[PDB]
């Protein structure tokens, strides 16, 4: 629930490992991301070690911190479409 609320304000969350148990973190041509340069919301559960994005380095191998988009390609926010019909409604 806290993930999906974060996804609909379009901030790219990043789920990885914290102590092997997948706590959420925030994550704001292909230039690869590796390190924990991004903003980190939990307190002491940080990996303090080799993070990576687990997308294309291999299928299933690299250390986990994967970013999840709300929408794959973003053109217009749907908080505008919900304003678009609600006045007509």
């Amino acid at each position: 629930i806290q993930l999906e609320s974060a996804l609909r304000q379009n901030i790219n969350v990043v789920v990885g490992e914290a102590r092997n148990k997948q706590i959420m973190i925030l994550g704001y041509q292909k230039r690869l991301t590796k390190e924990d340069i991004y903003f980190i919301v939990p307190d002491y559960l940080i990996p303090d070690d080799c993070l990576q994005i687990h997308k294309l380095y291999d299928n299933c191998m690299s250390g986990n911190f994967v970013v999840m988009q709300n929408k794959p390609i973003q053109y217009n926010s749907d908080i505008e479409i919900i304003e678009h019909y609600t006045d007509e409604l």
């Binding site: 102590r19 092997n20 148990k21 002491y44």
Partner: peptide, 22 residues
């Protein structure tokens, strides 16, 4: 699950060590 529990214990032990020399 057991492995995860062991890892958590190791982390807590490390944290405890990092606060006191004893």
């Amino acid at each position: 699950v057991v492995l995860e529990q062991r890892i958590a214990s190791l982390e807590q032990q490390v944290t405890t060590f990092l606060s006191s020399q004893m």
